[PDB]
Every structure is written in structure tokens, then in C-alpha cells.
Amino acid sequence: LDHESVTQAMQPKDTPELRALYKSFEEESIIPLWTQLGDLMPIHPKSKAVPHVWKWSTLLRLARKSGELVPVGRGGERRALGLANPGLGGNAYISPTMYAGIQYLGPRETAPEHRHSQNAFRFVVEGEGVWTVVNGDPVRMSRGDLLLTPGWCFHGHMNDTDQPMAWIDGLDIPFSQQMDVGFFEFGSDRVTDYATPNFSRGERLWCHPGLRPLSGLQNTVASPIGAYRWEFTDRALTEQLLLEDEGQPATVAPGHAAIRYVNPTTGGDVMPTLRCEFHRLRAGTETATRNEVGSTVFQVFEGAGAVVMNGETTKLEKGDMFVVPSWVPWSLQAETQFDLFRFSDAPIMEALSFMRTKIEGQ
Amino acid sequence: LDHESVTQAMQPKDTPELRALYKSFEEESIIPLWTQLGDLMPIHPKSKAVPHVWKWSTLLRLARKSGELVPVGRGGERRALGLANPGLGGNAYISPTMYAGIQYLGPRETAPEHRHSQNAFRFVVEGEGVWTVVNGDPVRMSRGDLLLTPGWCFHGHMNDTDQPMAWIDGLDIPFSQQMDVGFFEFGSDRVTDYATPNFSRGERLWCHPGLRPLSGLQNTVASPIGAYRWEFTDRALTEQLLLEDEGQPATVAPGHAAIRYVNPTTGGDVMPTLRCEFHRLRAGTETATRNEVGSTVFQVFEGAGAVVMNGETTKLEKGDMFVVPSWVPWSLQAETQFDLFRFSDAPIMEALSFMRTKIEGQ
Amino acid sequence: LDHESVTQAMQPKDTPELRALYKSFEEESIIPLWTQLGDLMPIHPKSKAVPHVWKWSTLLRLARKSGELVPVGRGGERRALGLANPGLGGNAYISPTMYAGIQYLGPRETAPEHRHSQNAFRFVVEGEGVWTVVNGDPVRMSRGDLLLTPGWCFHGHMNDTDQPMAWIDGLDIPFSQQMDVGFFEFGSDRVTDYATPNFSRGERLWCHPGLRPLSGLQNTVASPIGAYRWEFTDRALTEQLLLEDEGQPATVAPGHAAIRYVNPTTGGDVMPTLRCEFHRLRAGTETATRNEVGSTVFQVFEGAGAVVMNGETTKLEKGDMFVVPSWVPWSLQAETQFDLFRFSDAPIMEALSFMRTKIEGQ
Amino acid sequence: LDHESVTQAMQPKDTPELRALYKSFEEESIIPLWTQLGDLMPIHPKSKAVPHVWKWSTLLRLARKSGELVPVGRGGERRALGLANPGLGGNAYISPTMYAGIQYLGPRETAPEHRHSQNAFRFVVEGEGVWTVVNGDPVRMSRGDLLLTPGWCFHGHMNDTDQPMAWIDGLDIPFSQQMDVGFFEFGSDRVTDYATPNFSRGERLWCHPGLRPLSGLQNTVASPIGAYRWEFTDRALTEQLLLEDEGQPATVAPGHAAIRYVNPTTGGDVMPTLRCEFHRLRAGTETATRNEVGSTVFQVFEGAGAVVMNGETTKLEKGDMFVVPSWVPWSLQAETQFDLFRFSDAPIMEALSFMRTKIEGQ
Ligand SMILES: O=C(O)c1cc(O)ccc1O
Ligand SMILES: O=C(O)c1cc(O)ccc1O
Ligand SMILES: O=C(O)c1cc(O)ccc1O
Ligand SMILES: O=C(O)c1cc(O)ccc1O
Secondary structure (H helix, E strand, O other): OOOOOOOOOOOOOOOHHHHHHHHHHHHOOEEEOHHHHHHHOOOOOOOOOOOEEEOHHHHHHHHHHHHHHOOOOOOOOOOEEEEOOOOOOOOOOOOOOOEEEEEEEOOOOEOOOEEEOOOEEEEEEEOOOEEEEEOOEEEEEOOOOEEEEOOOOOEEEEEOOOOOEEEEEEEOHHHHHHOOOOOEEEOOOOOOOOOOOOOOHHHHHHOOOOEEEOOOOOOOOOOOOOEEOHHHHHHHHHHHHHHHHOOOOOOOEOOEEEEEEEEOOOOEEOOOOOEEEEEEEOOOOEOOOEEEOOOEEEEEEEOEEEEEEOOEEEEEEOOOEEEEOOOOOEEEEEOOOEEEEEEEOHHHHHHOOOOOEEEOOO | OOOOOOOOOOOOOOOHHHHHHHHHHHHOOEEEOHHHHHHHOOOOOOOOOOOEEEOHHHHHHHHHHHHHHOOOOOOOOOOEEEEOOOOOOOOOOOOOOOEEEEEEEOOOOEOOOEEEOOOEEEEEEEOOOEEEEEOOEEEEEOOOOEEEEOOOOOEEEEEOOOOOEEEEEEEOHHHHHHOOOOOEEEOOOOOOOOOOOOOOHHHHHHOOOOEEEOOOOOOOOOOOOOEEOHHHHHHHHHHHHHHHHOOOOOOOEOOEEEEEEEEOOOOEEOOOOOEEEEEEEOOOOEOOOEEEOOOEEEEEEEOEEEEEEOOEEEEEEOOOEEEEOOOOOEEEEEOOOEEEEEEEOHHHHHHOOOOOEEEOOO | OOOOOOOOOOOOOOOHHHHHHHHHHHHOOEEEOHHHHHHHOOOOOOOOOOOEEEOHHHHHHHHHHHHHHOOOOOOOOOOEEEEOOOOOOOOOOOOOOOEEEEEEEOOOOEOOOEEEOOOEEEEEEEOOOEEEEEOOEEEEEOOOOEEEEOOOOOEEEEEOOOOOEEEEEEEOHHHHHHOOOOOEEEOOOOOOOOOOOOOOHHHHHHOOOOEEEOOOOOOOOOOOOOEEOHHHHHHHHHHHHHHHHOOOOOOOEOOEEEEEEEEOOOOEEOOOOOEEEEEEEOOOOEOOOEEEOOOEEEEEEEOEEEEEEOOEEEEEEOOOEEEEOOOOOEEEEEOOOEEEEEEEOHHHHHHOOOOOEEEOOO | OOOOOOOOOOOOOOOHHHHHHHHHHHHOOEEEOHHHHHHHOOOOOOOOOOOEEEOHHHHHHHHHHHHHHOOOOOOOOOOEEEEOOOOOOOOOOOOOOOEEEEEEEOOOOEOOOEEEOOOEEEEEEEOOOEEEEEOOEEEEEOOOOEEEEOOOOOEEEEEOOOOOEEEEEEEOHHHHHHOOOOOEEEOOOOOOOOOOOOOOHHHHHHOOOOEEEOOOOOOOOOOOOOEEOHHHHHHHHHHHHHHHHOOOOOOOEOOEEEEEEEEOOOOEEOOOOOEEEEEEEOOOOEOOOEEEOOOEEEEEEEOEEEEEEOOEEEEEEOOOEEEEOOOOOEEEEEOOOEEEEEEEOHHHHHHOOOOOEEEOOO
16 A cells, blocks of 8 residues: 555544644644654655756866856866756755765866865766875875865865866765754965875874774764775775676675775774765676665766666766666666766764665575 | 854855856856855854743643644544744754653553554543553553654554543754655554553563563664652652752752663664653752753643743743753753753754763853 | 594705705794694694593582681682683683682672773572672672673672572683683772662663663673573573463473573673583483584583583583583583573674574474 | 781680591581681782793794604694793793794694684794685785684684794683683594685785774674784884874874784774784884783794883894793883784783783883
8 A cells, every 4th residue: 555545534524624734733833743744654755856967078178167257266166067966956955964075176276175075076977187185194196086074183185286176075964964064174375285296194003904093083073085096996896797707706786896984993984974885896797786875976977878767768978977866766777887986975874773775586 | 253254265256157156056056155155054053943832821831722623543543743943944843953742641542563663651640541562561640751753663542541641742853854764554443452551561561670680682773661750750850859968979060960761782872863851959959050952841740930041030830841952052040849851852952972062151 | 524534745854955945934923834733733623721620529629728817908809719620731711712719708808990802691500698889880790690890881799698609600711711812900809889889870771671761772792680580590491381381482492491691781692702601401401412513611500410411411400510621512400490690702703604503303 | 918818816725625626627618718718819910920031043043943754644633842931830822812823834834724713813923925824715824913702713724835834822721721611622634624815714804904894793602703913913013103203193102103903893802802903113212111910922923122021121133932920020122123923912901901001101
């Protein structure tokens, strides 16, 4: 049974006294339950957000043009283009939980030192030689690099070359706004440290596999790894595929290599509200259909193939971004070898025990 | 500095080419960051919900009248009156995270066996001899009793007497709706077990202080205590006040006794999304002003006194309910001995490391 | 295969040069592996301690006589009689991990305020009106009461009546000695607070089922419950048996009711090194045979029946105590209703992932 | 005050009746507390084990000679030379908790596939081209490499060259024997997989910094990293020293670089009972004196310098090994740059809340 076909027993006699009680409800800020239980409590998630794809060539065109018409600054903070879900009523929200944005930084430009409670990351698909300084620690950016900017950490963005750089912001702005959890402070209009060191202190303490500095024995809520570089991400994915060739367990599913970016102090997610993963599918691979609670977003990093969402196949190229709202059945099909970057609100669904998963063949 | 007075550097020249790019934004579901950073990222939480009080005598009048005009049933599920925040745009939400409701159950009436992912509790200020059956386990209800109804547990409500009963629902419906996390199923139109045992199985395994059944060694995400009875709550609060008389640490603050309802398997909160507490202030007590992230709601259980919210003192009687949205400075003043029941979304703010606290004298 | 029948390939030619190398080993503090792998690394635990029973009437006789011949004091600290395992080479160790002792306190006598790192508890089978003061907090003692005395907490013992009292100490002295973990300090020769309050502060904050004081929100490594009283222990066990009569899950095994004493801040064990449980078997009940890693000890609190250890049935009366060393197969058989108190080193085996369990019918 | 000078009040009158009660004690396996509280409960740890150094050139000489006189085999399992503490009564125990051993494996020799509950690691100071197969996964060994062999994992050792190899075993045999926690099984006399792959599967899934395979989302009690290679260990230590040159936090103490080997699924220790660290001191560095609960052991990997234990300076060269029993004050002084490998029983002291630390300048 469901909400579209269950017997509605309460439906009250439309008398003067009834309408007067309803007038009374309006006055006293009361809304009766009966007239809407179903809206409030669906059979399964039925998101206001809608599955949607953004074409990279489109995003690029509008990003370059923004580069012409407007400087990056101080009220607006970033020349960034936020992907707004058609189903979310004009809000700059790619899902109810996440903001997803393309930030363009033109030659020699800078962004200034700020912090907010909202958790953030920067993912670079094309570009080079911009540097984000986090809590004073300059973190070089380049193709394939995930940089983190966990909540309440100072950060600003200096471009060291005559080249523009395009990256994606991901944040829990939509969660943080709706739940009243936001704080924000100012730092400097120049980035705090103009130095351009090829690797960051955080990297240099923390990017040694299976090793922990004795000066860093305390666990952290977010990750101290300022950058997860393309190289390591690439090699991990390749080994998983080589291991598969060799008949050893590694891949998540046949032909489907994948890793999660993690906080090394805990082995858990990079930040309290956001999970990041990277996936490499072999040419020909088609993932089982999944329904998962919460929203995820992917960007095609390399290769060619397709998503299916609610049964609708959309063809996908390098750079394209799509969102799968809560519970929408989704799968991915690689034409060539298909490299994809992923973020979701899953750590929220998981901390609060709201997660569920339906997979096709089980 | 803040968002009302920082220099806005980006403000682009209003040319034809600019307006064309903006037209282009609308078409492609893009919203640029610059025109609204401040809305998105405030200096501190600035909730859409508003501090509000509901007068019990008012809620009672409208609840009784609902008892006349409408039966409790099957589409509408409950004859319950939801406290809607004036600041939340018509939604039946007392805060962005919580639903708060007054449910009236008339003589001999029943509610039927359902379950949903949404977490729930039932708190009885006046009434007797209704019974909620949880996963088949009948749980008697009476003045002062917190009953839990954790997510995904079957539940229905049979009234064993010619008396009406009034209680409050509290749920994370507003969280669960906005985050797309809701599921819902049907059970029976009679409650599953008409038996009326004076205490429930859960109570009888789990309400022995400092003792755990060896058949219940596994930890749970929600509490197995079906009911936290007035008696124990009352005695705890009294002892804390006696201990204070005796010069021993106990009270949270001078004259301010208080306890948190807990999951005994973990010592943590009753449910993943909701904290419940009970407070007893001595006559004359005035709490330090607090700002806390997330929303809380209180109901005056006994006595007389006042709240101050944003500096506005409101006088309060037995049964009244008020909400303090995220970050609104609040304090409480007891005229007589002031007993109050409390719920909040704090376990969410805390799991996700979003919590902060400003207290007056420190 | 095993160590008694595997081929020994290394066995070196007994030449002058070999004996010279062995002489050399002795000199340099070297012991070669080859000559003893099997001693060092058995097929399954093969404890030096031996299953043993102590007859209460025996312990009582020797305790009273100790009462005549010797006062309780200041070097010797306690007039206590420690159960020494025949297999543990003269040490006052009931198992390799635990000390088990019967302490006699005669009329009007006191013990003085000390503390040590070693974790301790006091369990009273017969007696009344002695009081242990813990960190200044007087904790009354009587038949059935478990008192805790966690490591590094000051404690002393005043007897308020013309009656002697007999209880059992349990401690991790044998663990703490062998692992070099012991510290010890002095407090007073009178107990710190001669007052005799019928319940202790700790009880009065913490013994309210499912409730936590807001002044005690921090988790603890040991339990803040100073006393787990007979009443609650008794009622818990009875309810589990009533629930069984009623066809509801409760008992661990058919006719076998049981509870674990717990730290309410965590739901975990009372102390880092020691687990305490209480068991009530129905007349006729015979438990499945178990092998568990680590040692346990039981005292018959009420009733009559038997243990089987390595196949040897021993008949048991009120007060008797037996130990089951690591991995010895054991079971219990109730003739009448059989009440038993239990402690083990299981939290150690469990924290370090050394635990295993073999049960007969599975 | 202490146990050498506190008043001994109990000392009973030596009468016939007293001696008869004592005779009675012996018969009934009772040992009275009074006559020995102080032995049992010292003021601070006073270990039976003694600070001791083993000279590498000595260990090497006896290891080579063992290579002549005896083959590695099947009863004796390993041609390994265990460092026995003079203070531990003939047992092959370097401390009460740990076994420390030097294993010699001659040309073309193998060890066979076994497993035991006891946790183990292999650390190579000099040697190359031996391979330990763990649960079928061949793990190459070379200078500076820590290999893990967590409890209950099959393992055997094949030497692929005409060269001998010398390494150290470290195990919790002494803990496991004394606490009755040991199990042991047989596998094959050839290692299971003669293949010699330059890196192991475990490495290849798990040695990518800040990355986790989605096929390995479950946490583990021991580490899945089969090998922590010299390279990464070396670079980590160097960066910490470069960071210090650059005025950035990194080192534990001035001139004192250091890392802990960790389980990447948790950020915690490599195994439940054993901590491993590596330290690199700058020439001239002298560490503050420490007292720590539990025993540690170090091996000088490179450089030259000294330890001080109970005030006794001993000079130290490449390969030397020393043990610091529980609570012995210790410090380290580098003459040249001083590289050292370290293991301890600290995870035990820490899980059970027995740890304490006294440091000189605080
Ligand atoms: O700092 C950033 O790059 C940033 C970018 C956004 O699109 C939104 C919020 C931010 O703080
Ligand atoms: O079952 C209830 O009593 C209930 C009451 C509400 O006001 C909202 C949702 C519910 O499930
Ligand atoms: O304080 C006690 O009652 C005690 C009794 C013992 O048998 C051994 C150590 C102790 O500290
Ligand atoms: O497998 C080994 O290399 C080993 C070595 C030892 O010295 C002691 C126990 C072992 O299992």
C-alpha cells in the first residue's frame, strides 16, 4: 500500500465551526497533521532536486566570459559559477546538501584570506600553478588534485602565472544554510604567504604511507592532508586493475576500480559532511543499478561513457558533471576507460543512521 | 568587519554583453557567486525561524475542539496539531530540524501500526492510561513520561479509558524532509497487542540502574528504553538539589538541577537526531545567557517563570512551549520551582562538529 | 598435527663446537628458539593455574580465627585471606590475572585511606553496616552489594557495629604485578568521613535508570557507580525469568537469567581490567559447555548445584568459590535455583582481540 | 611515606595457635595478605627485568655460528636467538611483555607456513632478497623494512639468494604465555607461493597516502600494510628535519624527528599489543629523561651515540639493542645523526588505562 491509495478516515465535515477552528489554527501558528501526513512522510525519499547534467564545454564558455566581464574581489569573494538544481526553487544548490561550483581564476589574480564553518574542497580538472594558502600553508594546485579546506581554516587563492585556472568548489553550503550552522570571518586581501613551495608542510608530514608523526598523535575531525595529488590517486587505481588482471581481490566490482579520500588520523571521511572518491571503470564496464540515500555528484575526469538516472541514459564527456539526488536509481557505463571524481553527503546520512542501499544483483 | 560593510570589488559593468551572459546563466542553471556570497555565508547563524511561544491553554482549547470536529484515522494518521514557526514559510516546522506537535486522543480511540525512518518521541504533560505499542511491546503512558519511538520501529496508540489524552510529538520530520531521508510503511489499524501490562518488556530488561542483560550485549543506535518514567526523572532532579544543599557537586549551575535522557547501551543520546533533557530550577534562579548552535524547544512541566530570547522576557505557565532557533541568546528565570522538558537537534550539530557555545560569565 | 608429534629438523650435532656456542649463549643472555618453540607457543592455552574450588565454610573458619589472632592495620593493610592457585608457584594469585580474597573486618575496626593503580571491587555475601569511603564518598555495604574501587581512587573501610563483616576483594594485582603497572599512595588511618549516609552521592547522581546528570556529561574509564545494590540486581534477574515465562526474549539461554555490571557513561565494563556479572539459573538448568580465553571466578551466592571443569563435577553450596583458568571447558548445573556472582579478566582479552569462545551446541 | 618505612600494625603474636592457623593456610591454598602487601603493591613499578644492552657484533657472531652448527627446521621452527633478560629467571623474554630475537636465514633456506594468536613483526637491519609470505601474499624484505605478521595470519620465510639474512623478530610471546592467550596451527614446509613479486598486494592496495580502496572499507584490528619500507620511513624523518630548519612545527622535540608505524584503517597502532616507531636524532641532541609505564626496546639502525638508563650511560653502535623496563628513567644522546627503531607494549598499557609519563622539563 501507499499514500496515493490508503483510506482517508479523518476528513472532517465542512461546517461553519470547522472553518472557524481552521481560521483559529492560522492565527495561532498551528497546522493540523491530518491534511498532509503524506507530503511530510513519503514512502521513500522523493527529492525536490532533480537529476541533472552540466556540459563542461558549456561551463568553460561561461567561465571564460565571466573572466572578461567581472573581476574576482571582496564582496562577491569568488568569480565562481554555482550549479543550481532546477528542482530547488532558484537556490544555488546542486542538491539539498551540497554546493557545486566552477571557479575561474585569471592571470596573476588573487583571492583573499577568509574562513567559515562550512566545509570545502577544491578539485582541479585542467589548470596549473595556482596556490591556495591554508592556515598559512601554501598548497600548489594542478590537474587531478583534490585540495581540502576544512571548516574554520583560513584560506586564499594566488595565481602565479599568465594562465587562467579552472577548478570545482564543493561545499556543504546548502546543508549549513538550511540547518543554521554558518559562521564567517575575514583575513587578508593578499594571500598570507606568497611563497610557492612545490609541496606543502601538511603533505610533507602526512603523505608518507602508513606513517604518523609523533608530533601529530592527536586525531582530527577533518583531514590534515592539504592535497591528495593526481599521482597517488592514479597509481592506486592502476594497481587495483593490475591486481584484477592477476586474479587478486582489489576492485569493488568487476572492472570497477575505486578509492575513497580519507582523513589519515582516523581512516574516516575527509571532512564531517563530505565524502570524496575517485573511480576508474574499464572500457565496457556497466555498474549495477544503485539507490542510495543522500545526494552524490560526479565529474568525468577522463574518457567517455554514460550515466543512467531514472532510466534515462545521458552520454558524457571529459569535464561533465551530474547530480543524483537521494534515492534516484543510477548507473554508469564506460565506453573507453572512464575516470570520475565523486562527492556526496554520505557522511551525514551515515553519522545519523539514515543510510540505505539497494543494488541490482542481490 | 562584516557583510553589510565590506568593499564589493566584483560589481560588473552593466553592458549588453553582461546582461547576455546573465541570460545565459539562467538558461544553463548557473547562478553566479558574486551577487550573493553574504546571503549564503553569514557571520553567524541567522535563522529563518523565529523565537516563538505557544500558550498551553490555547493549544488545549484547539485540541479539544479538534476532538469534536474530526476523528483520528488513516490518511491523516494522527489528530495532531503541529506548531508552525512564523518564520518558516507555511511549513509545519517548529524549527528547521524539528516537528513539535500536540496530539489529542479521545476516549476508546486508537491509532494504527506504522513505521517511518523519522525518529520520534511522545511526551505526556497531562493524561493517563493510553498505551503505545512499539514493535509489539505495549508501553503505558502517563504525566511526565517520555516514550521513545526510534526510527523504523512499528508503533500504534490505543486509549483504554473514557478519558482524552494530550501529549507532544517531537520528530526530526523537518530535517528528514529537507535532506531526503524519509521512508514509511504500514502496519495494522488496531494496535498489534491490546494487552495493557503496567510496564513494558524493554523497561523490564533495561531499567535497572547500572545493569545490562547478557542477551543485550550489542550496542544500539537508538535507546531500547521504551519509557523514561516521571518517578525516576523526578527523584534524579531532587537528589541533585539535596546534594547541592549538602555542599556536593551535582547541579549544572547554582540552583539549576538537570539530566539528559540517554541510550543505556552507549551513554549517548536517545536517538541519532534528537536530544531530550529535563531541568528543575530553584525559585529565584536565573540561568546565564547562552547562544548554542541548532534549535531547542522546551515545555514548562510545572511551576512558573520566564524566558528571555533576544532580550525579550516572556512570562510562562504550566504547559507552554517555546522555541529558540540556532544562536538566539536565551535564558530562563524561575519564579517558583520551575520544571521543564527539553529537546534539541544538538546530536546533529555535535556529530557533524558544527556545535558552539557562548555563555555569559566566561 | 601438534607439538608432541611434529618432526624436529633442527636438532644439532652434539659436538665440542656446539657446546661452546651454548656456553657462549648463557654468557651473552641468549636463549635459542629451537630447543623450546612448543613451550612458548602452545596449540591452545594451557594454563599454569588449575581449576580449583574453595569451600566457604572453610574460608569462614579461617577468617574468624584470623579475627582472633591478628588485628587489621597498616603494614599488612588488610586482614584478608587470598586464594592462591595450586598451579601458580606459591603466588597469592587465584589466576594469572586476578587476586581473589576474603576480607574479615571485626567490630568497630577500620582500614585506612590508600590508593593504588590496581583496579578493585568489594563483594559482600554475608554482613551488614560496614562502610567504604571512596574519594571521600561513604558507600554503605550489605549482602549482595558490589562496590567498586577503581584504580587511583582513595579508599578506607569503617565498621559501624559490634558485628564482623566478611566480603570478597577482587583485583587485577596478578596482572599488574607481572606487567609492571603498579603505583601506590597513602591517605589516612581513620576513614576520611565517618558519616554513615544510607546511600552514596555517586549512587544518588547515577543510579537513575536511563538518566545522566548534565554535570557528568564526560565519559569515564571506570564506572562512577559506587555501589550496585542487591535489590536492583535481584529484580533484574527475576524480570528476565518472568519474561521467559511470558514467552519473551530475555534470558541468555533457556532457564539461564544473567546481567553484567556496567559503567553507565559507556555501557562497557565496570573497570578497564575486570568484568563482573550475576547469574540466576532455574532449578534443573545445565549450561552448554564453554571454553573461553582468560580466567573467570564465581561465588555461589544462594542455592545449590554443581560445576563441571575438565569433566570433573564438583558439588557446590552457598559461598563456595571456584576458578576456571583460560580455556578449561566448564559448565554449571543448578539443583535448586542457583544465584552466582562472577568476575573475569575478559575486558583484557577483549581489548587486545585475544578472546575466543567454543560453545557445545553450535 | 613508603613500604620500607610505614608502621606494621598487624604483626601477630607467634603462638601455637597462630602457627596452627598458618599450617591451616598452607593446606587450604590460602595466603594471608598481611605478610606481604608491599611486594604485591609497590610505590611505583619495580620491574623484575633489568635494563640491558646487547652488542650487535656479538649477536652477529653467535648468529653466523648458529648458521654453521644447526639447520632451520620444523620442531624448532626458526634458527632464532632470543634476547633473555637477566632479571627474568631464565625465560626467553626481553621484557615481561615482549620477545625480541635475531633470526638468521642462510642461503636458499626456507621456513614453513604456520600461524599463532601471538602478534609478530620482522625488522631487517642488514640483508636482502628474503621473502615472507603472509596469508599467501609474498612480501619482499630488505634493510630498514618493518614487516608485520599480525596474529592468526599464516606465514613462512623463503631465501632467494646465496646470501644469509639477519632480522629481528618482535612478539608478544611473554604477554601471551603469562596471560594464557596462545593458539598455534600448522601450514606448509615450503612457503605457499614461491613467486618473488617486488611489492606485495597489501602494499599495492594500501600504500597510497590518504587513499583507501572501496573494497577495504571495513576497519581491521591489525594493519593490512604488509611492509613499511625504508624509503618512506627515511623521507618522513628527513622532511621533519627540513621542516625544523624552516621554522615549522614537525619534530617531537628540538632536533628529534620521529614517526609511529600505524594501521591505516584506524590511525592507531600496527597491532593490538605492540607499538613500533622510528626516531632520527640530529648530531648533538639529548632527549629529556622519561619514565614511561611498560617496556620498550630500541635497535640502533645507523649512527652512533648513547643511552642513559638509571643514570648509567652506555655507548652504542649500529645494530645494538637495549631494553628499558617499566618506569626506568631513560634518555638518548646522539653523537652523529642517530637513526633508531623502537617497539613497546604501550598499546596494552594504553588500552587498559595504565599508562603514565614523567618528562624532565615539565
Ligand atoms: O573559498 C572559496 O573558494 C569558495 C568558493 C565558493 O564557490 C563558495 C565558498 C567559498 O568559500
Ligand atoms: O505516530 C505519531 O504519533 C506521529 C505524530 C506526528 O505528529 C507525526 C508523525 C507521527 O508518526
Ligand atoms: O583495599 C582493600 O580492601 C584491598 C584488599 C586486598 O585483598 C588487596 C588490596 C587492597 O587494596
Ligand atoms: O615466525 C617467526 O619468524 C617467529 C620467530 C620467533 O623468534 C618466534 C616466533 C615466530 O613465529
